[PDB]
Structure formats: structure tokens, C-alpha cells
């Protein structure tokens, strides 16, 4: 029952310091080499560093050399990854893993941890600006409404339509980073006979700034 628990990852500013811990159980910690592998927001697996079972020899990714320091504690079966001078290229999910293979060289990883999330950003907690999206004729039998959630940090934001009453035909596109802030959009499609006669409300809630804005979708006044 091999188990790997990562902790210590959190939100940190660029240049700040952060240390990730990795507790190991279910196996002999002194017999294996431990490693850190990170996965970027673009879902790219990137190896960080590898430490030998005795901690004598440490191997680090070249981009990270001089800033990340790997340290092993065979008395408590815990792996420590010191991170200094953190850059906005270091924000990724950091996975603790157990190296395999022989004494020399890299190897594959059978057992991975659930991973710590590390977010490097200089943005302060900012509430989203919630904007209604209204079409510019009822051509089709269906009408598509939308909702723009712009300029919020950190994540996440809960976006629902009519407090969950509108579930079918709802598309919530993932958040994108613009100017150190996040921005997503949500689209709902309803029959033409309902809107604008019936009320379609975009419900957004940002727990980090403790903000809740319910936006009524109003057809575009032109007079």
C-alpha cells in the first residue's frame, strides 16, 4: 500500500519562497530514489529534481538549477523540495514520485502522489466583473444567451443559470489568463418563445472575494 502525500504548495508571489513536503508510506524509503515531477497548466509533464536514497547526489532540472534545493529525511520518510526565486514559469502541479530502475540513470515512475498545486502570481484578490451577453431577430428556433466573467483572482468562480434551473444546453468554457487575471464565459441556449419573455439570470459567485452577482440578460436597447 505505497502512499505519497504532498503538501506545502500554495499561492506565492514571484521571487517568493515555498517548500513542498512529501510523506511516504507503504514501502522502504531508504531503498528507493525520490523525484519531483511537475505538470504545467498546459498539461505538460516536466521532471524537476531527483535525489538518491542517501541524499548524497542530487539531480535537478536545468531551468531550475540554483533555485530549487532537494532534501531527504530518511528518519521521517519525508521528501523536501525547497523552492526559491519562484517564477511565473514555476506555477504547476508538483507531483512526488518514486524512482524505479537501477542505481544509475533516470527511470520510470510507477507510484505518483496526488500532487501539490503551486501558483506563482503577483495578482491581488480581485472580484470578477460580470457582463450580460445579449444577441444583436429570432432567426433560428433557439436563442443563445451568454455571460462573461472577467478580471477575477484567484480561482474558481461558480457560474450557474437560474440557480441551476437551466442545466441543459449550458456551456461553461474554462478560464483564461489575461493580465494576471482570469476570464471565462458561459453560454446558455433556450427556446425562442421563452426569452425575452421569461427571465434568464446568470449567477456568478467568487468565494475568494466573497462576491455574488446575479445578472439579468436584457435584450439590447437601441433607442
Amino acid at each position: 500500500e505505497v502512499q505519497l502525500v504532498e503538501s506545502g504548495g500554495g499561492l506565492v508571489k514571484p521571487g517568493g519562497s515555498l517548500k513542498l513536503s512529501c510523506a511516504a508510506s507503504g514501502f522502504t524509503f531508504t531503498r528507493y530514489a525520490m523525484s519531483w515531477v511537475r505538470q504545467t497548466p498546459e498539461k505538460r509533464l516536466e521532471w524537476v529534481a531527483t535525489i538518491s536514497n542517501g541524499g548524497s547526489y542530487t539531480y535537478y532540472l536545468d531551468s531550475v538549477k540554483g533555485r530549487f534545493t532537494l532534501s531527504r529525511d530518511n528518519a521521517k520518510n519525508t521528501l523536501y523540495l525547497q523552492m526559491s526565486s519562484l517564477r511565473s514559469e514555476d506555477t504547476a502541479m508538483y507531483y512526488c514520485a518514486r524512482r524505479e530502475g537501477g542505481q544509475a540513470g533516470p527511470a520510470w515512475f510507477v507510484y505518483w502522489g496526488q500532487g501539490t498545486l503551486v501558483t506563482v502570481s503577483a495578482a491581488k484578490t480581485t472580484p470578477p466583473s460580470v457582463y450580460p451577453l445579449a444577441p444583436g431577430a429570432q432567426t433560428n428556433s433557439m436563442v443563445t444567451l451568454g455571460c462573461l466573467v472577467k478580471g477575477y483572482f484567484p480561482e474558481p468562480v461558480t457560474v450557474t443559470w437560474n440557480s441551476g434551473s437551466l442545466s441543459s444546453g449550458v456551456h461553461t468554457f474554462p478560464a483564461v489568463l489575461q493580465s494576471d487575471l482570469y476570464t471565462l464565459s458561459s453560454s446558455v441556449t433556450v427556446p425562442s418563445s421563452t426569452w425575452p419573455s421569461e427571465t434568464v439570470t446568470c449567477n456568478v459567485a467568487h468565494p475568494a472575494s466573497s462576491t455574488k452577482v446575479d445578472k439579468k440578460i436584457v435584450p439590447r436597447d437601441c433607442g
Binding site: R31, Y32, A33, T50, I51, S52, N53, G54, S56, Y57, Y59, R99, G102, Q103, A104, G105
Partner: peptide, 8 residues
């Protein structure tokens, strides 16, 4: 050994 990650 060159590149050792497991001491004897």
C-alpha cells in the same frame, strides 16, 4: 559509477 542514484 557515473550518475548514481542508489548508494551501495
Amino acid at each position: 559509477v557515473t550518475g548514481i542514484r542508489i548508494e551501495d
